[PDB]
Design a protein around this ligand. Structure first.
Ligand SMILES: [Fe+2]
Lengths: 112, 311, 94, 112, 56, 94
């Protein structure tokens, strides 16, 4: 009867693997073709991103005007390197929801 | 002896009845097999018919309704006109009707009352289980939700409760049967089985929710060895809850008796407290078989093993 | 009650006080069906399900809804619940 | 014996679906009633959010003072449209952890 | 035959719990030892972070 | 103790040390009922539930508040618990 137990255990692994597919956060990289998620054969050409990743690469807000006339205090706010928008070659974390991918943001190593 | 159905009395056709229940079973199950001549064929028993079995109770020797449910499925043979039923009490309805409910922190009795009120299920005065449950969102069947919150109530030190239907829903505590019957007098054969199959000597709680509750509460490590588990439930959001969950998990492994009785004690049911020899055990499972000779078979076990396995 | 206007609160809904490790929550059942008004509030009568002096809880204590209703923001009792007589003692009856 | 296999397969799907419930990232929308997660009957009235989503809608930092006396270089930093705090009607991504929801942030379509 | 069903159901829960482990978002707290994830015995001394969290 | 002012920590509350595989948690029970004061803290005497020298734990070992009383943030034992005599020695008894 060990054969039935082994076959059934194979079915356990099969069903669990199928259920876990297309779920949970996953790593990815951006390409010219589109999003390239780790563990996927094909690049995803249509995907969503968090709105904080859509910031302009330069001068994302004029941010105030403080005086006019005698002097003209007004400025623009350059984007920092960390908050720049997505570009090709960026390692990113992606949330997988079936056939709808959401790019959470870039990923880098953690300092002590 | 008496099978009421809606109007008739089909006790004049049944070859045998088998009342079977499990402690974790969906419902009290009656499987009555009938011969189906022209007379029984005329009334046209369909699924959904209401069966009431009446027999002389063991306690007072008065005719009492020992089963009150609904025919869940009929299977008819044609070459031999033997109609066979498989009756279920109305907890089978709860085990099939799915529904999603979001619950705040509250007790199991309030949740059961809420389910019954929502789905219009009659219920007697439900016993106050007392234990306070954490907030959860459920999706499984109504009986599944009730069993889940009752399991979480057994954890945190609450008493073991089981839901049985009868005419109106009842919250039946396990060790509260009226008569503690002694099976040694009619012991056709017994099978005392002992094991370390599901023994739990240690438990390392790793709380997924904060009050960083972590600890180990090994209970008999010196004797049986450190048979350790890991309880990693979100519902444990407290140090006392963790300790009570740990204390409601330790056991000396599987310890049951496969009892066979030559006389059918009619009123036995799953969870009842019954005696064999001097000791007392809780009925994990009972399987009556009311053939021409009444007969009963039982599977009973200790409280610790039942709490570990079914709760 | 307190919540979004248009939210329907029905008769038979249970609202309870705050349970603790010491005390079981005292249950109260709404006696009416009403909708939240333009003041994003509405006053609904209720009774303690358990008869007795325990039902005579203080103001502001009935603050927990049993079955989540979308649109209800918060609940409270402005006044202490009254009545709630217990069984007469044997000495007074004698 | 095919009936046993079919019943067991139904149990496979049941157990896997129950295990996968309340896990993984999910989409959601904000309402006056509270958070409204896709695939949930009821709105979640108590939820957590990332601290970067709690920025003020306007003037989230005074950001420096650079001179005083002869001139008074000082300014305020308006919030950009992308980094504004949550408001009713925002499509958001939510991380589901049992009965504890965390709103990762808004979601928008990805440019090429 | 109820024993086989109970054993098999225990196997269902075992396999599902094993598959769900190490997956999905989880809460955590930072310590001097390193990351301390809820539901984990040991602190993770090597972990990644989003680049927007590395601001000065 | 440490936590929200006005919270009442009652007599009979149980606190324990952190459990490990080498040593189990050592339980202690509070002998007094007090309220968290203006300092958001309060000092309460307690006894080990189990007799013996094991109850004489070191300072800072008692950090787990076993129960659930709302508003309590954290605890600690500044002094090493004292007393906790074991059985009298054979030679001393001789
Ligand atoms: Fe300037």
């Amino acid at each position: 009867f060990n054969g039935i137990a082994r076959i059934l255990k194979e079915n356990m692994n099969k069903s669990v693997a199928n259920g876990t597919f297309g779920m949970g956060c996953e790593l990815a990289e951006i390409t010219a073709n589109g999003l390239k998620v780790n563990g996927y054969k094909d690049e995803i050409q249509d995907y969503l991103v968090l709105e904080n990743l859509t910031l302009k690469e330069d001068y994302f807000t004029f941010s105030d005007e403080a005086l006019s006339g005698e002097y003209r205090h007004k400025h623009k706010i350059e984007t920092p390197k960390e908050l720049k928008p997505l570009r090709i070659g960026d390692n990113v974390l992606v949330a997988v929801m079936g056939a709808e991918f959401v790019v959470i943001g870039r990923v880098v190593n953690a300092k002590p | 002896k008496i099978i009421l159905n809606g109007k008739y009395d089909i006790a004049n056709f049944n070859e045998g009845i088998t009342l079977s229940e499990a402690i974790d079973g969906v419902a009290y199950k009656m499987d009555v097999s009938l011969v189906e001549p022209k007379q029984l064929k005329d009334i046209n028993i369909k699924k959904g018919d209401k069966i009431i079995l009446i027999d002389i109770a063991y306690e007072s020797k008065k005719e009492e309704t020992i089963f009150d449910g609904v025919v869940w499925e009929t299977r008819r043979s044609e070459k031999s006109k033997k109609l066979t039923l498989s009756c279920r009490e109305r907890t089978v309805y709860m085990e099939e009707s799915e529904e999603q409910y979001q619950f705040k922190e509250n007790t199991a009795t309030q949740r059961i009352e809420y389910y019954c009120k929502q789905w219009n299920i009659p219920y007697y005065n439900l016993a106050n289980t007392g234990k306070k449950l954490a907030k959860v969102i459920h999706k499984t069947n109504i009986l599944d939700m009730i069993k889940k919150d009752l399991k979480e109530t057994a954890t945190k030190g609450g008493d073991l409760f089981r839901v049985r239907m009868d005419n109106k829903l009842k919250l039946f505590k396990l060790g509260t049967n009226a008569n503690v019957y002694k099976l040694d007098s009619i012991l056709e054969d017994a099978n005392f089985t002992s094991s370390f199959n599901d023994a739990v000597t240690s438990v390392k709680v790793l709380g997924k929710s904060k009050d960083p509750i972590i600890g180990t509460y090994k209970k008999d490590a010196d004797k049986f060895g450190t048979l350790q588990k890991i309880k990693q439930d979100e519902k444990i959001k407290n140090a006392k809850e963790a300790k009570k969950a740990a204390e409601a998990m330790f056991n000396s492994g599987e310890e049951t008796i496969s009892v066979d009785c030559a006389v059918d004690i009619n009123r036995i049911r799953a969870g009842d407290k019954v005696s064999l020899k001097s000791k007392e055990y809780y009925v994990i499972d009972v399987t009556h078989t009311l053939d021409s000779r009444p007969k009963m078979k039982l599977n009973i076990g200790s409280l610790e093993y039942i709490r570990r396995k079914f709760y | 009650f307190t919540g979004v206007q248009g939210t329907i609160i029905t008769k038979g809904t249970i609202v309870t006080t705050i349970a603790t490790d010491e005390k079981q929550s005292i249950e109260f059942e709404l006696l009416e069906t009403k909708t939240i008004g333009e003041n994003e509030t509405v006053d609904i009568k209720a009774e303690s399900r358990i008869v007795g002096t325990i039902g005579n809880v203080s103001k502001g204590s009935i603050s927990v809804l049993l079955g989540s209703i979308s649109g209800v923001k918060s609940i409270t009792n402005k006044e202490d619940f009254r009545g709630g007589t217990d069984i007469e003692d044997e000495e007074h009856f004698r």
